[PDB]
Scaffold this active site. Structure first.
Site, PDB file in Angstrom:
ATOM      1  CG  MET A   1      -1.460  -1.255   1.027  1.00 44.87           C
ATOM      2  SD  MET A   1      -3.038  -0.794   2.022  1.00 44.87           S
ATOM      3  CE  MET A   1      -2.637  -0.390   4.073  1.00 44.87           C
ATOM      4  N   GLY A   2       1.937   1.224  -0.855  1.00 46.49           N
ATOM      5  CA  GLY A   2       3.088   2.539  -0.498  1.00 46.49           C
ATOM      6  C   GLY A   2       3.528   2.697   0.745  1.00 46.49           C
ATOM      7  CB  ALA A   3       3.887   4.361   3.211  1.00 45.07           C
TER       8      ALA A   3
ATOM      9  CG  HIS B   1       8.373   0.048   6.610  1.00 48.85           C
ATOM     10  ND1 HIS B   1       8.325  -1.655   6.589  1.00 48.85           N
ATOM     11  CD2 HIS B   1       7.441   0.561   6.966  1.00 48.85           C
ATOM     12  CE1 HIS B   1       7.163  -2.206   7.162  1.00 48.85           C
ATOM     13  NE2 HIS B   1       6.844  -0.955   7.756  1.00 48.85           N
ATOM     14  CD  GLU B   2      15.479  -0.711   5.100  1.00 44.77           C
ATOM     15  OE1 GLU B   2      16.184  -1.808   5.180  1.00 44.77           O
ATOM     16  OE2 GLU B   2      15.970   0.108   3.988  1.00 44.77           O
ATOM     17  N   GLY B   3      10.340  -3.755   6.350  1.00 40.80           N
ATOM     18  CA  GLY B   3       9.614  -4.882   5.964  1.00 40.80           C
ATOM     19  C   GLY B   3       9.655  -4.551   4.601  1.00 40.80           C
ATOM     20  CG  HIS B   4       5.940  -1.950   3.036  1.00 43.40           C
ATOM     21  ND1 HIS B   4       6.919  -1.142   3.267  1.00 43.40           N
ATOM     22  CD2 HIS B   4       5.374  -3.045   2.735  1.00 43.40           C
ATOM     23  CE1 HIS B   4       5.362  -1.116   3.517  1.00 43.40           C
ATOM     24  NE2 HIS B   4       4.806  -2.070   3.657  1.00 43.40           N
TER      25      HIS B   4
ATOM     26  CG  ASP C   1      10.229   8.230  -0.065  1.00 43.54           C
ATOM     27  OD1 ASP C   1      11.947   8.260  -0.489  1.00 43.54           O
ATOM     28  OD2 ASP C   1       9.665   7.868   0.544  1.00 43.54           O
ATOM     29  CG  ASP C   2       6.347   4.528  -1.654  1.00 41.28           C
ATOM     30  OD1 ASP C   2       7.236   4.255  -0.781  1.00 41.28           O
ATOM     31  OD2 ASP C   2       5.461   5.403  -1.532  1.00 41.28           O
TER      32      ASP C   2
ATOM     33  CD  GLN D   1      12.045   3.252   0.365  1.00 47.46           C
ATOM     34  OE1 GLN D   1      12.641   2.467   1.415  1.00 47.46           O
ATOM     35  NE2 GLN D   1      11.469   4.084   1.379  1.00 47.46           N
TER      36      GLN D   1
ATOM     37  CD  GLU E   1       6.205 -15.163   8.955  1.00 46.96           C
ATOM     38  OE1 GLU E   1       6.399 -15.778  10.601  1.00 46.96           O
ATOM     39  OE2 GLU E   1       6.440 -16.791   8.786  1.00 46.96           O
ATOM     40  CE  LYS E   2       3.187  -4.819  12.248  1.00 46.49           C
ATOM     41  NZ  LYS E   2       2.309  -4.402  12.306  1.00 46.49           N
TER      42      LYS E   2
ATOM     43  CD  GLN F   1      -3.277  -8.448   4.903  1.00 50.44           C
ATOM     44  OE1 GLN F   1      -3.375  -7.704   4.819  1.00 50.44           O
ATOM     45  NE2 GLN F   1      -2.010  -8.617   4.216  1.00 50.44           N
TER      46      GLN F   1
ATOM     47  CB  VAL G   1      11.368  -6.282   9.443  1.00 49.11           C
ATOM     48  CG1 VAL G   1      12.798  -5.603   9.436  1.00 49.11           C
ATOM     49  CG2 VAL G   1      11.816  -7.222   7.908  1.00 49.11           C
TER      50      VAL G   1
ATOM     51  CG  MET H   1      10.342  -2.516  11.173  1.00 48.17           C
ATOM     52  SD  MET H   1      11.998  -1.174   9.826  1.00 48.17           S
ATOM     53  CE  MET H   1      12.839  -2.248   9.843  1.00 48.17           C
ATOM     54  CB  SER H   2       4.041  -0.895  11.429  1.00 49.23           C
ATOM     55  OG  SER H   2       3.001   0.228  11.844  1.00 49.23           O
ATOM     56  CB  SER H   3       3.863   2.983   7.979  1.00 46.91           C
ATOM     57  OG  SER H   3       2.660   2.365   7.275  1.00 46.91           O
ATOM     58  NE  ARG H   4      -1.781   1.684  11.025  1.00 44.02           N
ATOM     59  CZ  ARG H   4      -3.191   1.138  11.623  1.00 44.02           C
ATOM     60  NH1 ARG H   4      -2.929   0.583  12.863  1.00 44.02           N
ATOM     61  NH2 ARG H   4      -4.164   0.707  10.554  1.00 44.02           N
TER      62      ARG H   4
END
Ligand SMILES: O=C(O)[C@@H]1COc2ccccc2O1
Ligand SMILES: O=C(O)[C@H]1COc2ccccc2O1
Lengths: 272, 282
Positions: free
Chosen positions: A39-41, A43-46, A72-73, A76, A143-144, A148, A171, A179-182
């Site tokens: 879903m964009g944004a 981070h390392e997890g992606h 930005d995305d 990366q 697996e975060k 889902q 991650v 990790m999460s963007s929240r």
């Protein structure tokens, strides 16, 4: 007449039928198409999902970027050596509005389905759509978001989808915070108390030699030691999210509210 | 799994037809799917022949009485006949799954159709189209054909199936095939065997009513509907469930100059459906 594709560069497509054409034309020349739904944004997890997709021999990586209702995305992805980003509009994805959709089994109603009871229908519907557009050999999920992932496996089994679903380990930051963007919204206090989700889960994972009750009590003690952490749930289940068996492999899942921020975590658990 | 070509190969396991299907495709044959509930008749065989006519075609006919759309114990089952019919058409593949192989987890993940599935056939049977779209999705995923064939008899079914296909981005072409009729106009249906000679004779009122309405339609919508209504009223012991004039996609759009007229009616205990293309006025 198939859309333009330049090897080793980041090719961006917004039209479902473009990405469909390239992907199908790529498989025929012996690339194995890997799908990383995001879903964009990023981070390392992606990026971990991307990396797992890249180390499949002959892989070409498709990363979707779509918000289920920037440069930005792409930098990366460009920097990870990704060849296809799929960045469709809401109108390209839903040209006929919300019409036919996926109805998840009863699992979609538990745990995260408690406050957001339609959330996973949304997720499954878009995932099914993406799988039909891209037709990947393998699809990569973290697996975060464990519930889902279990539902997506269920979708794939249930609708006879011919794709491998790959679950990539969470991650974490240095202190274990998943990790999460929240995470960026947590003030200093909240951020320090947030560590308790993963500490409780790890504590449980090791307490588990003493059995399930010991695991749960260990996790709870730790959460109890943190201020400003409202636990929505803390549940141990089998790996498919049915009832925990007496012994054997399991999964422990937690969710909590810190101020206005909802964080989740989960961990593998062996009983005995 | 084996594939003796120019012969009819029967596979019951989803895996075996998926493998054979993919192999045939990877060699350049175009895979055609004809989903059916068995008890086959000439209306099915016209679906088969449309499929045969596509060049490099390999034809899969699926036969499966789907417990999700159902009444269920009453459905006609005639496999020996069904199979000999397909031999005779030179169909190369019959896919006959077991319920266990199709629903090993019962009803877990299912398709939820749009609001069109609550209306007409779906009004008193709100779960019927869900089961139909679930098994059709699964069949397309198992067999992965270039094209999938349906009769226009079950026109609402056809329209929802094209919703299925557009909404989930399925890379398959849906082929609608005109209803095959008995010499008197009666739409062919496996249900037809449940009419006694009296009801059989009355049953002609449905196609008569539609064809009447199609020609009355130079005079407008109301005339077409009154023409159909008059024919049905003059029929002994035809009980009308519905008779409706819609846009061709049946949906939240007003009827323009082009439409479809749909009828459902009971003869004794047997429900019949029929429909037709209407042009209104000019
Ligand atoms: O036998 C038939 O007429 C029906 C026709 O429509 C069907 C739809 C889905 C699966 C099987 C079907 O069989
Ligand atoms: O941005 C993400 O973390 C992911 C997480 O999971 C996703 C599932 C389906 C579509 C997009 C998704 O984005």
């Amino acid at each position: 007449a198939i859309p333009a594709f330049h090897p080793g560069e980041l090719n961006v497509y917004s039209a479902p039928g473009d990405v469909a054409d390239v992907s199908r034309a790529l498989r025929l020349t012996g690339r194995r198409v890997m799908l990383v739904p995001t879903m964009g944004a990023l981070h390392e997890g992606h990026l971990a999902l991307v990396r797992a997709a890249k180390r499949v021999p002959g892989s070409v990586v498709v990363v979707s970027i779509f918000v289920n209702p920037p440069d930005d995305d792409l930098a990366q992805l460009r920097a990870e050596g990704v060849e296809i980003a799929f960045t469709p509009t809401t109108a390209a994805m839903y040209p006929d509005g919300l019409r036919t959709t996926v109805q998840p089994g009863p699992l979609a109603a538990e745990l995260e389905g408690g406050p957001r009871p339609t959330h996973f229908a949304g997720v499954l519907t878009v995932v099914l759509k993406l799988l039909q557009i891209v037709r990947p050999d393998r699809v990569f999920f973290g697996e975060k978001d464990y519930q889902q992932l279990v539902l997506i496996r269920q979708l794939v089994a249930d609708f006879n989808l011919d794709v491998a679903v790959v679950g990539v380990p969470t991650v974490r930051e240095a202190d274990g915070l998943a990790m999460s963007s929240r995470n960026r919204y947590l003030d200093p206090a909240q951020r320090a108390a947030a560590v308790a989700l993963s500490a409780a889960l790890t504590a449980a994972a090791h307490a588990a030699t003493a059995g399930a009750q010991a695991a749960l009590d260990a996790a709870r003690a730790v959460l109890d030691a943190a201020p400003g952490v409202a636990v929505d749930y803390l549940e141990l289940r089998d790996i498919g999210l049915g009832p925990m068996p007496l012994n054997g492999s399991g999964r422990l899942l937690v969710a909590a509210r810190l101020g206005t921020t909802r964080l989740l975590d989960n961990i593998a658990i062996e009983i005995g």
